[PDB]
């Protein structure tokens, strides 16, 4: 199993040009499914399955949650800035929260905030208190615990968040469980006296994947360079791995690609 629901909020003083100062996007199992920003002023579906399995009051309510959060975040930006004796400039509040459903049936919850890209405050593991990462968050810690905020977030994370995640996973079961095969290409580059072999996987899903370079049978990917897993625009992923080879010895290298969508692991040589 292992499903996830995540919301991430960005509130910035300096978006900037033609960009919304406030944004919230939601992800299920690592895939964007809802979106809200201060320009649209509306929560909006980003997958067909969320749009198909909700009614108008879902979007109207979420929209208003976002509009209210938008105001709350406007104020909180001002408050944090003041705690930092900041008078202007680029500053950002980020929030991350959500829940995991592991394939035990066990649950996990997270709620943490950053300020200017650094930890500011977070609800701790037991969800009974908040932990200030910086002295500037101490007063907030105090106010929240005096207001029973930990209890409130514990409730959302363990009940509301989880219950809704179960619905989302149900709604997009087919989409989330689909498989798409990557088209693989190996390409050879030469600008110096060093041969750069590249292997790219295009449009694979799900996310997990293995791409490696072998030098006549032996993974010689101990010195292969990966650009990691990066996203396409259509809900699939891309990855590319290179390796430097002595001119000559180009016919000794093979890229091997393992992925859940494949009939068998792909194995590809370079040929000019």
């Amino acid at each position: 199993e292992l499903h996830t629901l995540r919301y991430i909020r960005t509130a910035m003083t300096d978006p900037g040009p033609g960009q919304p100062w406030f944004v919230t996007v939601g992800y299920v199992d690592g895939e964007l499914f809802v979106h809200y920003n201060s320009t649209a002023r509306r929560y909006v579906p980003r997958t067909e399955w969320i749009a198909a399995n909700t009614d108008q009051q879902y979007w109207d309510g979420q929209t208003q949650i976002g509009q209210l959060n938008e105001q709350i975040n406007r104020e909180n930006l001002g408050i944090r800035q003041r705690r930092y004796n900041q008078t202007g400039g680029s500053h950002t509040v980020q929030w991350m929260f959500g829940c995991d459903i592991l394939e035990d049936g066990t649950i996990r919850g997270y709620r943490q905030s950053a300020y200017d890209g650094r930890d500011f405050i977070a609800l701790d593991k037991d969800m009974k208190t908040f932990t200030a990462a910086v002295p500037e968050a101490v007063p907030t810690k105090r106010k929240w615990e005096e207001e029973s905020e930990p209890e409130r977030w514990k409730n959302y994370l363990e009940e509301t968040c989880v219950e809704w995640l179960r619905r989302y996973v149900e709604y997009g079961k087919a989409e989330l469980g689909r498989r798409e095969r990557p088209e693989v290409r190996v390409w050879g580059k030469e600008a110096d006296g060093i041969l750069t072999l590249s292997c790219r996987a295009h449009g694979f899903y799900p996310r997990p994947i293995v791409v490696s370079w072998l030098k006549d049978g032996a993974v010689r990917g101990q010195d292969a360079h990966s650009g990691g897993i990066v996203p396409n625009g259509d809900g699939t992923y891309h990855t590319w791995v290179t390796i430097e080879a002595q001119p000559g010895d180009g016919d000794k290298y093979q890229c091997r690609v393992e992925h859940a969508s494949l009939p068998q692991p792909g194995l590809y040589s370079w040929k000019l």
């Binding site: 939601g26 809200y36 979420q62 949650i65 959060n69 975040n73 909180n76 907030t140």
Partner: peptide, 8 residues
């Protein structure tokens, strides 16, 4: 579903 942020 998204949820209310707390007031700071």
């Amino acid at each position: 579903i998204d949820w209310f942020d707390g007031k700071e």
